[PDB]
Swiss-Prot record:
Progressive deamidation of Asn-65 transforms the homodimer (beta- 2) into and heterodimer (alpha-beta) and finally a doubly deamidated dimer (alpha-2). It comes from the Eukaryota. This is Seminal ribonuclease. The keyword Nuclease applies. It comes from Bos taurus. Keywords: Allosteric enzyme, Disulfide bond, Endonuclease, Hydrolase, Lyase, Nuclease, Secreted, Signal. Allosteric regulation by both substrate and reaction products. It is found in: Secreted. The gene is SRN. It catalyses: an [RNA] containing cytidine + H2O = an [RNA]-3'-cytidine-3'-phosphate + a 5'-hydroxy-ribonucleotide-3'-[RNA]; an [RNA] containing uridine + H2O = an [RNA]-3'-uridine-3'-phosphate + a 5'-hydroxy-ribonucleotide-3'-[RNA]. The modification Deamidated asparagine is found at N65. This enzyme hydrolyzes both single- and double-stranded RNA. Its EC number is 4.6.1.18.
């Protein structure tokens, strides 16, 4: 099975330069979030893996789903919000790309504790 840490890197990490309008359409497919159905909303982080992992050492916050292994980034990060457009209907998974700068909240799990879910941005 794919590990949660790997699953997080594939689904949310894209360290480097922020994205064009077609970014989300290629990333949601390339990174495998358009198989079987279209993933509604998804966020990619453009900061480094280290900066993202370090978030597990930062401010603890309760996840949106009530879980309590979430951490909020001290600093804002360059991220891209990917949202399904109304015209998108699997298999025609279309996405709206939005670049933003926000704190991220990620769930951390495993040993050692690394990001396993992207909870939200603030």
């Amino acid at each position: 099975k794919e590990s949660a840490a790997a699953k997080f890197e594939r689904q949310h990490m894209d360290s480097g330069n922020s994205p064009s309008s077609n970014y989300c359409n290629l990333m949601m497919c390339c990174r495998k979030m358009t198989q079987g159905k279209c993933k509604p909303v998804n966020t990619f982080v453009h900061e480094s893996l280290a900066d993202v992992k370090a978030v597990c050492s930062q401010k603890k916050v309760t996840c949106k789903n009530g879980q309590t292994n979430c951490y909020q980034s001290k600093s804002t990060m360059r991220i891209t919000d990917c949202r399904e457009t109304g015209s998108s209907k699997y298999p025609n998974c279309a996405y709206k790309t939005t670049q933003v700068e926000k704190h991220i909240i990620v769930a951390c799990g495993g040993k050692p504790s690394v990001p396993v879910h992207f909870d939200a941005s603030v």
